[PDB]
Write a structure and sequence with these properties.
The complex is a heterotrimer of chains A (213), B (156) and C (207).
Chain A: E1 4-7, E2 10-13, E3 19-25, E4 33-38, E5 44-49, E6 53-54, E7 62-67, E8 70-75, E9 85-90, E10 97-98, E11 102-106, E12 114-118, H1 122-126, E13 129-139, E14 145-150, E15 153-155, E16 159-163, E17 173-182, H2 183-186, E18 191-197, E19 205-210
Parallel strand pairs in A: 2-11
Antiparallel strand pairs in A: 1-3, 3-8, 4-5, 4-9, 5-6, 7-8, 9-10, 9-11, 12-13, 13-17, 14-15, 14-18, 16-17, 18-19
Chain B: E1 2-3, E2 6-13, E3 19-22, E4 28-31, H1 35-40, E5 47-55, E6 59-67, E7 71-75, E8 82-85, E9 91-92, E10 101-106, E11 109-117, E12 123-130, E13 133-140, E14 152-155
Chain C: E1 3-6, E2 10-12, E3 18-25, E4 34-39, E5 45-51, E6 58-60, E7 68-73, E8 78-83, E9 92-98, E10 102-103, E11 107-111, E12 120-124, E13 129-139, E14 145-148, E15 157-159, E16 163-164, E17 169-178, E18 188-193, E19 198-203
Classes of the chains: A mainly beta (213), B mainly beta (156), C mainly beta (207).
The complex binds chloride ion (2 copies) and magnesium ion.
PDB class: cytokine
Keywords: secreted, immunoglobulin domain
Assembly: trimeric
Chain lengths: 213, 156, 207
């Protein structure tokens, strides 16, 4: 099947900036490429067809072009409504295949996360489970690493992460990491640690508690 | 450079199963016809599809000709379909002429054929109703799965 | 107006089957194929298949050819996608489209063995700014609504998207207030799960 490699998957930019998204095809697709836009509510709108033809009812700042096996969608000067998702689609051969998408995000200053760890509540322990929760709040850029330790040993199993979309007011990101154990397992150990490390960190940020304090 | 590889007598039907023919004014039209009506109406319903070169992604490079009182070949020049008085070439120097179409099956549907203009990329043979007539035109492909640019090709 | 109107979201059990519809209007139905596309968390956009409404001919992505069955009803100018043998991997938003140009609004299909289950609401208190939270654990289906002090607190609040922990959803909400304000004044999360008629108010108390 033809693979459509779409880059970058995320692009941070500012109002008025010119930007370009790229799709590389693993086989020759000629001029048989569409570009699609998707709004947050899931609504699709085709922008470009046949590599460079602009759909009616699409702002003129959008254009499509090709140079080789690289296809690009260019937005000449970004407006607020443009900070959404975009996908390419090839129709040269079956199965039709899509690029993996690009989300256009707002650029802002880097920011370190505020990290908080929380022990299981007595209420949860009553019901036989134990969830240890870590918040990594209001950071930028969006990529971050979080590690759990139990009594100094890294723990990977039982960890689930959840990532906010970009904040509409301050353009930061947040994350929660939750380690869920049985009460039996939880109560065998002394200390629990979540450690965050980010572009902005001079040292990893380590937050911990002793389950008896 | 590229010699004619094959030459196939064909009946061509559109999305509503209407048969392509050349009228007395050399215009390509479609009409409802049984397979019997199609034979009754030969040679005006019999198209010679001459193949010159495989050029996938786009398709097989072909010409489409008909022989009535003279031999004519289909041209997409200026994005306007016409029958042009000329024989299909013995050899073509390249696949770029306005008489060249890339014949390709619709992806996933091996018996539905499209004919893409060589000279006007992204434009295709299509059937379109104008007033009383159903005409062969050249149409920009504006979206996928447009049945008006799909045809049945029956070998004869 | 060209319109493709899809049926509503479905909640279906693993191993069962579901049939979603796509009602077309504003053009001649049999002139254009209908396409089906899957949007997931795990595999982004995937083309499923297409159908020719004039003769019923179909094409599939070989990945989906034993999962999906496409049909039309000419008279009602509606296209259908039936999915069989459902698993968690089939949870996704399914779109129909004319030409991959005009798109339906999508149909969310969630595959789960869970029955309607209220959340357990657990307070998150620490062991100049203090961060508190509430863990909203093990509910089905979506959504839950979370507020803090009945909506009086918002500048310092955010609520994380729900995730599947087992066969149930879990999320957490965070609120940050000055240390002079809490535990001086009370901070309470309010959680509603309309599917189960649940409303819980959990006060966050110092450990
Ligand atoms: Cl077919
Ligand atoms: Cl198939
Ligand atoms: Mg010319």
């Amino acid at each position: 099947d033809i693979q459509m490699t779409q880059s970058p998957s995320s692009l941070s930019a500012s109002l008025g900036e010119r930007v370009s998204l790229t799709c590389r095809a693993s086989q020759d697709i000629g001029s048989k490429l569409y570009w699609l836009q998707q709004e947050p509510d899931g609504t699709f709108k085709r922008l470009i067809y046949a590599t460079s033809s602009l759909d009616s009812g699409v702002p003129k700042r959008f254009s499509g072009s090709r140079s080789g096996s690289d296809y690009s969608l260019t937005i000449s000067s970004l407006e607020s409504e443009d900070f959404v998702d975009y996908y390419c689609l090839q129709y040269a051969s079956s199965p039709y295949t899509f690029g993996g998408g690009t989300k256009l995000a707002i650029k802002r200053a880097d920011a370190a996360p505020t990290v908080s760890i929380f022990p299981p509540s007595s209420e949860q322990l009553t019901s036989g489970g134990a969830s240890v929760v870590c918040f990594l709040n209001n950071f930028y850029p969006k990529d971050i690493n979080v590690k759990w330790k139990i009594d100094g040993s890294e723990r990977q199993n039982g960890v689930l992460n959840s990532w906010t979309d970009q904040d509409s007011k301050d353009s930061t990101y947040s994350m929660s990491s939750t380690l869920t154990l049985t009460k039996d397992e939880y109560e065998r150990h002394n200390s629990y640690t979540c450690e965050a490390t980010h572009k902005t960190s001079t040292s990893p940020i380590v937050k911990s508690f002793n389950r008896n304090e | 450079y590229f010699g004619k590889l094959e030459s196939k007598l064909s009946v061509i039907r559109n999305l509503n199963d209407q048969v392509l023919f050349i009228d007395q004014g050399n215009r390509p039209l479609f009409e409802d016809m049984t397979d019997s009506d199609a034979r009754d109406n030969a040679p005006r319903t019999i198209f010679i599809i001459s193949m010159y070169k495989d050029s996938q992604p786009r398709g097989m490079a072909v010409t489409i000709s008909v022989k009535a009182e003279k031999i004519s070949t289909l041209s997409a020049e200026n994005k306007i379909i016409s029958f042009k008085e000329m024989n299909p070439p013995d050899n073509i120097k390249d696949t770029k002429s306005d008489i060249i179409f890339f014949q390709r099956s619709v992806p996933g549907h091996d018996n539905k054929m499209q004919f893409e203009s060589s000279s006007y990329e992204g434009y295709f043979l299509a059937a379109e109703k104008e007033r009383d007539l159903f005409k062969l035109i050249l149409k920009k492909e504006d979206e996928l799965g447009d049945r008006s640019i799909m045809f049945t090709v029956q070998n004869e | 107006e060209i319109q493709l109107q899809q049926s509503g979201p479905e909640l279906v059990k693993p191993g069962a089957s579901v049939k979603v519809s796509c009602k077309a209007s504003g053009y001649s139905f049999t002139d254009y194929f209908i396409y089906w596309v899957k949007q997931s968390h795990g595999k982004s956009l995937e083309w499923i298949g297409d159908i020719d409404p004039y003769n019923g001919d179909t094409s599939y992505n070989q990945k989906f050819r034993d999962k999906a069955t496409l049909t039309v009803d000419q008279s009602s100018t509606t296209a259908f996608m039936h999915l069989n043998s459902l698993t968690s991997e089939d949870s996704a938003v399914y779109f129909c489209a004319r030409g991959l140009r005009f798109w339906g609004q999508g149909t969310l299909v969630t595959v789960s063995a869970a029955k309607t289950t209220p959340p357990s609401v657990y307070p998150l208190a620490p062991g100049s700014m203090v961060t508190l939270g509430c863990l909203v654990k093990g509910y089905f289906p979506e959504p839950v609504t979370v507020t803090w002090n009945s909506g009086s607190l918002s500048s310092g609040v955010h609520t994380f998207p729900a995730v599947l922990q087992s066969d149930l959803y879990t999320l957490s909400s965070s609120v940050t207030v000055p240390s002079s304000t809490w535990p001086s004044e009370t901070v309470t999360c309010n959680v509603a799960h309309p599917a189960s008629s649940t409303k819980v108010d959990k006060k966050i108390v110092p450990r």
